Amino acid sequence: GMCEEEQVARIAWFYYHDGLTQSEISDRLGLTRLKVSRLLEKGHQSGIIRVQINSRFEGCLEYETQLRRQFSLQHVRVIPGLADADVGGRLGIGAAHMLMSLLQPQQMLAIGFGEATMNTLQRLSGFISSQQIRLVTLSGGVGSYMTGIGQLNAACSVNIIPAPLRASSADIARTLKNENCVKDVLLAAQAADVAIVGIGAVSQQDDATIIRSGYISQGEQLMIGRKGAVGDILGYFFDAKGDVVTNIKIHNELIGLPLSALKTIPVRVGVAGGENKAEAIAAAMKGGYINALVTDQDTAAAILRS
Amino acid sequence: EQGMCEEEQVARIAWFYYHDGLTQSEISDRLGLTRLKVSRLLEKGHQSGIIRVQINSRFEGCLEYETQLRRQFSLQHVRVIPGLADADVGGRLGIGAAHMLMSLLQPQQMLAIGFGEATMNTLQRLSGFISSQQIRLVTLSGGVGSYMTGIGQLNAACSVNIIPAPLRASSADIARTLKNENCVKDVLLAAQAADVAIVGIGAVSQQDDATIIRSGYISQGEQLMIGRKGAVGDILGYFFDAKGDVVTNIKIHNELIGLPLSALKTIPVRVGVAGGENKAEAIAAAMKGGYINALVTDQDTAAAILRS
Amino acid sequence: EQGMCEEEQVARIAWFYYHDGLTQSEISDRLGLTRLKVSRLLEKGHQSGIIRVQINSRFEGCLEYETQLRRQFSLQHVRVIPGLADADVGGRLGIGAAHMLMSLLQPQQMLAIGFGEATMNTLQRLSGFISSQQIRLVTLSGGVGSYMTGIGQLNAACSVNIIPAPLRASSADIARTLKNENCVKDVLLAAQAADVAIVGIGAVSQQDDATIIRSGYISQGEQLMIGRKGAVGDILGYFFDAKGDVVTNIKIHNELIGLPLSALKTIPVRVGVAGGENKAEAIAAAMKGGYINALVTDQDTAAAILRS
Amino acid sequence: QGMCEEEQVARIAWFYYHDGLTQSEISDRLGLTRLKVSRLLEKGHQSGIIRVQINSRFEGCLEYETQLRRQFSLQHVRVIPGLADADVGGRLGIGAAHMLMSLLQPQQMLAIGFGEATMNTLQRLSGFISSQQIRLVTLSGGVGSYMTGIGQLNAACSVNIIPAPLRASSADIARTLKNENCVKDVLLAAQAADVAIVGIGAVSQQDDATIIRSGYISQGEQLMIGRKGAVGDILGYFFDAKGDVVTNIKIHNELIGLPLSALKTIPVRVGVAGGENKAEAIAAAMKGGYINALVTDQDTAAAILRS
């Protein structure tokens, strides 16, 4: 009966496994209530009492914390992926469940367009009704939102921008943006408590969720990348440093809140997945457009990696 | 979907009551519900449009006013819901209008819809039929929000083609440009090609005390100005004279993004739904103009029309 | 009479009752008729066929089939899930069946279970219910492992009485020996004593693609020979003919450790879950034999049964 | 709600140890009560979701440990720090479990016996079985006699169970069952596992042993067992102080389940047993080579080396 290292190991056992009390341990070895407490903390600092997590798919908590601090996010969630479950369909369950622990009764919620965020409103039907959350659209489009507000107990406040998402010329756009009924809802949004938007990457060729939507042409996509864009948000493209790309035409033709305004809303939830969006998602936080991310393990990995 | 489904529960207790013939109570002791809860789901089924009440008889509606109306104006269809002591006399029009559409629309057909509590209540009472028969909807005028209260249900799986534009433009030129913005000119065509259209009818008469000007789409002084120029009523925002013809010297007409009356005429079956004894003047003008070749109104209003 | 004909009266009462939603009484003080006068004309409306109620909900046909099936076979309980766009169907049968069981089982009751994907997915979709309600479960057939993918969840705290033997013995006598080996004879009684039992149905048609042949419990040629002998389907490993009677000249029957079909009948509510258009005749035969007094199936299969 | 039971545990586990918060401080983050949190944490340890590695030579009682390792030639050994009663049976589990965690390789097969000893272990090894996707095979029939162990196992673990009772009424009924394909196959599966875990029973603890209490052996059968020279058992097979099995024993031929000679096939055979009155058998167990790894308490360890 001796040695300092042996004591450490002894009390550790008796504390964690056998599960005893700092005191109950004293009356076992010639040590004082205080004496035990010291060697215990000593155990972890020296590194003899190490606690490991054992649950396949907890690596999500490892990535989650790194992401959290290496980008400084108010909130992060990283769902695994498991055996299919579509994942893309899974990010919604995750993002929606996150919004539920963010939104407070009767608060305003700015929404973006896209399958990512759309599924989320679907998985948030219930919460919206009960807590009577007010919704507002961050960009025009109208129909590009119905597949989301399709539910909503037909009794929820839905302020929709009565305009298309993108105008023919950069002027018709300026005209519409100053048309009262549009100028209002823009306000409504810029005033939202929380905002949820998806992130689009430029890599994707005729395979993207913004090219398929017929919102931008194939050659308009290429020239966008060429100018240095790496991804987008609500139709606005940015570079890897997270800053907006100046020489872009489509920016001046989009009816809807610009990126500057988005930042106004306090909690901006971003939901995006796919290993091909990591660069864009990253750039997305470097610019501060989203201060809360929601993504799968794989996507998360790829981000922190490269 | 999770489980149970609210939609299936209604269909289930609907079949358990009418066909199998059970009592509101005896149905409770079958599914985890209270005698009261049952009564609720049944009511829902009716308002929603899940429960249809066909009445195989010539006397479904006021045949008298009905036939006269039918001939004095040559209408393809008409129905005059049984008048009743007030009770709004506006939502009831819905349950009747809805039921007519259910006997007009064929599976997978396109339906053009206007705006207003009249036609909006109808879509509400038409949800079930929309779903099951997978009816396609297209808006005859911009407004977007001015349609939510109708497209509120629709099992989130129904194709709703909405015009991405405001109802009225600030300038008559901004409107001209919006009407030529592809995504907008595209939905207009869709509607301009629908199979059946349903529109309410607004009257100049019911100045202010009409959810018409209350919709803030027209001013107090704009309203009066409207009348002075010979307007008696409107459709989707176009005002017309007693002879049923549109009023030319009206500015609001050129500021409206949305199908024009002339184009509305394309649609083969045009159902008009309107009540209020103060609207007869207009409703009649609406038929003389040929804007609607189908009408759904109440006893009172019908009389009112026939009389003077 | 008074004012109008009687056909018109029924037409008005109907509207005021169903659509306008009035009270049998509230309708009296509308026309010169008494509280009971109205009640008469209403029922008159239904019987005559003037007021006919139709249901409008894509996926109601299932309630059509349900009723026919329920009466043309005399079933205490019936459920017919649709199928819609995929959802697997086979995987949908479980959620439906489990959902039914929740509506039948009473707290702390005994539930005899069979083997097979059908029934096994049901247990999975009923993990929750079994735990809360502390339902007691007993295996109606040996096999053991052929049961784990079901009781896999079950909060590690539920009573699971499993027959400690294989499903089929090598000879018809080693089976007889095990059937009377206390620890097995006990679980058998346990089972023959359950309150509700749920089993799937196997069809003979299926060759080398059946849920009983791929399980390696019956050989390729053992299957053909059973069909030749007149069997059309099975339950718990016992085959029967279209008249629902068991096939006598079957060897496997005496090689099966586990409750016999006669005993199964003992159990009051016998829910059967099975789908697939190729099981139609089996499923039916299974009801004509009375092995199941409650069925759970999809529309297609339901149709196929009723048809041929 | 939301986060299933398993994730909830992993969450408050990571927010307690790594990020380092207080039992209370974490309540104010997820919809739970100060007490509910404490519960999820405890559950995390017991289920095996939370391991507590002790990278130190003194994890266990090295003295008794090393003597035991050499005086018996054991592959691995652990002598959990004894303590004031507290059952002296559940503790064995946490230790045994942790040992397996250091022996088992991903996707390997684990043969397991029956009894509170090894059954507790299974429970304290749930997490490990899941994540590591470890495969389980039973070394003895019994079925129900295993539920309390396989009760957890995230309903997605391959458990190959022998479809037969532990003991047959006749020694002939057992011979035939042992030759019933579905029975003969799971036996091979086990007979080929990568590691096995079995408890050890003692004849001595007559009556006052959850062995005879299991009703698989009678009061008079126990006694008769001793008189013929039996000191303890494994899987139902009794042996003498010399480590060899006792021939003139009846129950041996009525047991459906791997024979001790075949168990020896399995490379790593861990035995877990506590109780000062089991020393005699535990030692016979090693001199017989039935186990080449042992896991026991300080007392028991001493009692062994002493006499």
From Swiss-Prot, chain A:
Pfam family, one: Sugar-bind
GO cellular component: cytosol
Keyword field contains Chaperone: no
Taxonomy, superkingdom: Bacteria
Induction annotation: Autorepressed. Part of the lsrRK operon, which is positively regulated by cyclic AMP-cyclic AMP receptor protein (cAMP-CRP) in the absence of glucose and negatively regulated by LsrR.
BP terms from Gene Ontology: DNA-templated transcription; regulation of DNA-templated transcription initiation; response to heat
The keyword Cytoplasm is assigned to this record: yes
Disruption phenotype: Deletion of the gene causes a significant increase in expression of the lsr operon and results in accelerated removal of AI-2 from extracellular fluids. Deletion of the gene affects the expression of a number of genes associated with attachment, defense and pathogenicity. It also affects sRNA expression.
DNA-binding region extent: 22-45
Protein localization: Cytoplasm
Annotated control of activity: Inactivated by phosphorylated autoinducer-2 (phospho-AI-2). Phospho-AI-2 acts by binding to LsrR, which is then unable to bind to the promoter regions, allowing the transcription of the target genes. Phospho-AI-2 triggers the disassembly of the tetramer into dimers and reduces the DNA binding ability of LsrR. Dihydroxyacetone phosphate (DHAP) may act as an anti-inducer and inhibit binding of phospho-AI-2 to LsrR, preventing induction of transcription of the lsr operon.
UniProt keywords, alphabetically: Activator, Cytoplasm, DNA-binding, Repressor, Transcription, Transcription regulation
Residue pairs linked by disulfide bridges in the UniProt entry: none
An example molecular function term from Gene Ontology annotations: cis-regulatory region sequence-specific DNA binding
Effect on the protein of changing residue 232 to A: Forms tetramers in the presence or absence of phospho-AI-2. Decreases affinity for phospho-AI-2
Subunit structure: Homotetramer. Dimer of dimers. Interaction with phospho-AI-2 triggers the disassembly of the tetramer into dimers.
Family: Belongs to the SorC transcriptional regulatory family.
UniProt free text on domains: Contains an N-terminal DNA-binding domain and a C-terminal ligand-binding domain, connected by a linker region.
Protein name (database record): Transcriptional regulator LsrR
Gene: lsrR
From Swiss-Prot, chains B, C:
Subunit architecture: Homotetramer. Dimer of dimers. Interaction with phospho-AI-2 triggers the disassembly of the tetramer into dimers.
Described purpose of this protein according to its UniProt entry: Transcriptional regulator that represses the expression of the lsr operon (lsrACDBFG-tam) in the absence of the quorum-sensing signaling molecule autoinducer 2 (AI-2). It also represses the expression of the lsrRK operon. Acts by binding directly to the lsrA and lsrR promoter regions. In the presence of phosphorylated autoinducer-2 (phospho-AI-2), LsrR is inactivated, leading to the transcription of the genes.
Record remark: domains: Contains an N-terminal DNA-binding domain and a C-terminal ligand-binding domain, connected by a linker region.
Known regulation of activity: Inactivated by phosphorylated autoinducer-2 (phospho-AI-2). Phospho-AI-2 acts by binding to LsrR, which is then unable to bind to the promoter regions, allowing the transcription of the target genes. Phospho-AI-2 triggers the disassembly of the tetramer into dimers and reduces the DNA binding ability of LsrR. Dihydroxyacetone phosphate (DHAP) may act as an anti-inducer and inhibit binding of phospho-AI-2 to LsrR, preventing induction of transcription of the lsr operon.
DNA-binding region: 24-47
Pfam families: Sugar-bind
Identification of the protein by name: Transcriptional regulator LsrR
A GO MF term: identical protein binding
Family, per entry: Belongs to the SorC transcriptional regulatory family.
Induction conditions: Autorepressed. Part of the lsrRK operon, which is positively regulated by cyclic AMP-cyclic AMP receptor protein (cAMP-CRP) in the absence of glucose and negatively regulated by LsrR.
UniProtKB/Swiss-Prot annotation, chain D:
Notes on activation and inhibition: Inactivated by phosphorylated autoinducer-2 (phospho-AI-2). Phospho-AI-2 acts by binding to LsrR, which is then unable to bind to the promoter regions, allowing the transcription of the target genes. Phospho-AI-2 triggers the disassembly of the tetramer into dimers and reduces the DNA binding ability of LsrR. Dihydroxyacetone phosphate (DHAP) may act as an anti-inducer and inhibit binding of phospho-AI-2 to LsrR, preventing induction of transcription of the lsr operon.
Outcome following mutation: residue 23 to A: Greatly reduces the DNA binding ability. Retains tetrameric assembly
Single GO MF descriptor: carbohydrate binding
Family per record: Belongs to the SorC transcriptional regulatory family.
NCBIfam families (alphabetical): PRK15418.1
Entry comment, domain topic: Contains an N-terminal DNA-binding domain and a C-terminal ligand-binding domain, connected by a linker region.
Subunit relationships: Homotetramer. Dimer of dimers. Interaction with phospho-AI-2 triggers the disassembly of the tetramer into dimers.
Protein name: Transcriptional regulator LsrR
The species this protein was found in: Escherichia coli (strain K12)
Gene from which this protein is expressed: lsrR
